Amino acid sequence: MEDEDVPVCWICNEELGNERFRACGCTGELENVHRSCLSTWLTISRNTACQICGVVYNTR
Length: 60
Ligand SMILES: [Zn+2]
Ligand SMILES: [Zn+2]
Fold this sequence. Notes:
Elements: E1 8-9, E2 14-15, H1 35-45
Antiparallel strand pairs: 1-2
Bound molecules: zinc ion (2 copies).
Residues 24, 26, 30, 50, 52-53, 55 line the site of one zinc ion.
Zinc finger (RING-CH-type): 1-60
Subcellular location: Host cell membrane; Host endoplasmic reticulum
Subunit structure: Binds human MHC-I and CD1D.
């Protein structure tokens, strides 16, 4: 039960607790990120997949 604690979106630095958004499978903050600012961020920064592990954001 180590999943406890609330993760924070590495983009806007805000706790999400469990925003269901498969955008990457890293081992740090990236593992948890709001699909709101991430999906839109990569769109503004022009990105389709995490440049840390090579996983696509896959946003709705
Ligand atoms: Zn990643
Ligand atoms: Zn966020």
